[PDB]
Amino acid sequence: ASVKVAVRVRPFNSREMSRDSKCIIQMSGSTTTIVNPKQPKETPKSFSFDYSYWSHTSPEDINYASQKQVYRDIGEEMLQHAFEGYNVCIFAYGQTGAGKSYTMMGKQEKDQQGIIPQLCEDLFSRINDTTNDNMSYSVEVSYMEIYCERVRDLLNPKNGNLRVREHPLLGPYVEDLSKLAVTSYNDIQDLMDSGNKPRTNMNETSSRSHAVFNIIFTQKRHDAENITTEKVSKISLVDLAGSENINKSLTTLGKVISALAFIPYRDSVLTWLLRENGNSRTAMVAALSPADINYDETLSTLRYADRAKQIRN
Template structure:
């Protein structure tokens, strides 16, 4: 089990027309890659994150492009997916702060966000595979959480909300959610386009195309390998969750009325619950309290579905999207404090491998210790002059260990000791 903190980055977008028309001033400074400073005339606040992306002016030498953001955040998460871990990236911030642009972006060259870049990179790496014993499969789903109801964005004509269920082993899932098999980037790009067109958006004073729902794009990435040494077929499955949260907002700033006001109330309710979950998980750091005793995951659909990504079996990154303008100072500071709490969350990710894969890995780890054990018993004749095990002996050892495991209740270590005792007696 690999314990790791949630990786938190911040990104500041350029001024928009509304802010420029009001003569807004910049209250955000980034002194280096990881330090973000928020200041007014009377107060200065410093925050430290894993990355700080300054996108105020494209001519600035420190300007962070879409590619730069993906390279710093997305590439590492994709690597973890290939290792067999669940991964999650989610964007948080006030409405109009640049979350959807960061996660999905635009179709114009150089404007693609993390989601399309990761999908393209995933298929590029699988296409580069030359191992005949390794194969891949990819399935995707795309849903939105709108007013605490789940909609299938890949089947937008379906009526009624989908139900969230609890699997005793796999955890929360959405019943009857479409899951589409894809074989190349073109397939997945078409599905993204279908889902994006079906998302619920509306104009507010803060944003002409404000996302009124939380969107979750999920990739189920399966790696299958045939191990010639043991003749076993093994499998690793990684769930990649890419989340574009709806924008936090104040009714007086967004000008929300009627349906927009109701939407905003539901958005703020789920984000408030997310904040409570983050605070509770952050407070667990250094304590021995059990997570299940007091974390309010089920208080909203969003936090229920993200349960494993928040303090559970996942490698998780958060991108806090910020406006640079002094007229949004309260929202900026709230987002930075939110993000500062999130980086204290500890996740306990495990490689999602089947029992056969775990068995093969453990056996190979034992084989890799063979040299030292043989040398310690004066059996160096079983090692080649190059210091490696002979292929024959490695195969025999693994086969013998597997045979012992398959026909007894012994652990790998007990089987090794039994095998080694047979060899030296």
């Protein structure tokens, strides 16, 4: 069906506290409100979404949205539809340091694993609990980075510009991008890390880079009668670029993001590549900063998140 949209507000960072910023994001129910610091007179505009996560405070707080809480709703839902044979897409949208990479990948400790790891772990959990001998599964994963229209394989750095292609009958694809068959959450977890630090001004991870991690979940159902049925699902869990080198992919997105449900799909590697996410079940988690000093940026995203929700594949 349509596209579920979720938003999140993180705690203050070092920069926000160093400027003594104030919280300008409020949330109650599924509705999030935002206040204008440089115009405290204007009416705080409120937006409503499928999820308005409050994670400003801390895991000590009761009304804090733990990453386990955000997975269970969105993630644990997409896996369900993946299993249902459907194509899924979860992409973190936001400002640099807004909380995308923490929402998606997160941290390896304190039960701080983002959406991605939780989906993986849950995928294999759901798989080894399989009693029906008539079932066999296949799980091949990829993990690339799109830094300014160029595609870079995070799992095979031992090489690349990697061209994005368009199969005459099988849509776009990054040729020579590796796909690695895994047989456990451990094997698919290593690929993550080794692929993580891989990612290509500012310090650490380039603000302007998209990191797509895709899983081709393949299910095989046999039966003595007498053919084995096969239904495959493609799982795209993305980590978009800071919504602000060129990374006009994200800007090109805004255009594609609009006109929900022509469309300049080929104006950017990202928009073209995730063309189907089309026939797919997509989720968008917008990462928001509680900082007043982010008035515009934070508002922008919201407006973006409000439009995306208006989509429906």
